[PDB]
């Protein structure tokens, strides 16, 4: 679909069997989700944002369906203010910016 | 144009008679730019993301050119690690997400 930006580009995602709302975030290199239970081995990692760095759990090779489009990539879980879908997955669903 | 998301969506902008580089950021409600000494009044503000909040100066009705597309709106100036063009200006240049 084509998504205009008058509102936040929020979409429903499916990860680990449950639905969630997430933000399509072209300014994020990586995908960061709020605290949740996820099946899969994880490794402690750190990611920086506008206000500093946070501790996250890095799940590699996770299945995630974004607005009806399947992806399999890295998902970071930690105290992010909002669920953000970053470029590592936006590229997988074929997302581009257009103007 | 069409911008793929393999790499960061960096573009040249013109603001206050200066050229800078900034990210077309669908995850940013408002535009945030590095410290620059703009003229006119401003209102203090705090904005939050991954890592917490930074303090910024809010200027309104600032003229910005983005790839030759002119826009006018709010610009937040502060110690941000990266310049991001937010939705308040992305809408004004006709920018959409497409997959
Ligand atoms: C609350 C939703 C997002 C976190 C908002 N952010 C925009 C986001 O695109 C930032 C914009 C951004 C980009 C680079 C450095 C700092 C912030 N990207 C980001 O934090 O991504 C992180 C996750 O992947 C990593 O790659 C980039 C940093 C990592 S933001 O920078 O914090 C932000 C921007 C503008 C306002 C005012 O409306 C408030 C917050």
């Amino acid at each position: 679909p084509q998504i205009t930006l008058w509102k936040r580009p929020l979409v429903t995602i499916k990860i680990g069997g449950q639905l969630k709302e997430a933000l399509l975030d072209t300014g994020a290199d990586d995908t960061v989700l709020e605290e949740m239970n996820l099946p899969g081995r994880w490794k402690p990692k750190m990611i920086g944002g506008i206000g500093g760095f946070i501790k996250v759990r890095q799940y590699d090779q996770i299945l995630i369906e974004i607005c009806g489009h399947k992806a399999i990539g890295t998902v970071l879980v930690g105290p992010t203010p909002v669920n953000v879908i970053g470029r590592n997955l936006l590229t997988q669903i074929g997302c581009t910016l257009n103007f």
Side-chain angles (χ1 to χ4, degrees), chain A residues 1-40 42 44 46-69 71-99:
Chain A
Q2 181 171 77
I3 300 174
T4 54
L5 300 170
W6 303 102
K7 320 172 70 189
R8 291 196 178 108
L10 290 167
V11 300
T12 306
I13 65 170
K14 168 218 175 115
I15 185 175
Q18 82 183 149
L19 302 186
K20 268 174 197 268
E21 188 166 76
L23 190 71
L24 308 178
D25 185 352
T26 54
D29 303 340
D30 303 307
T31 294
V32 193
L33 305 179
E34 294 183 275
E35 191 65 31
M36 63 171 300
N37 320 90
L38 255 185
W42 61 269
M46 297 218 63
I47 189 145
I50 193 167
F53 290 74
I54 59 169
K55 276 169 61 181
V56 296
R57 322 200 304 276
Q58 176 172 330
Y59 297 83
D60 288 317
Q61 219 169 315
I62 299 295
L63 282 70
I64 177 168
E65 181 166 4
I66 306 159
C67 194
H69 293 247
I72 308 176
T74 296
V75 175
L76 308 178
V77 178
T80 178
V82 301
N83 302 322
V84 296
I85 306 302
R87 288 186 300 101
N88 69 312
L89 302 182
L90 293 174
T91 52
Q92 288 199 21
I93 61 170
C95 186
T96 61
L97 287 165
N98 298 84
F99 54 99

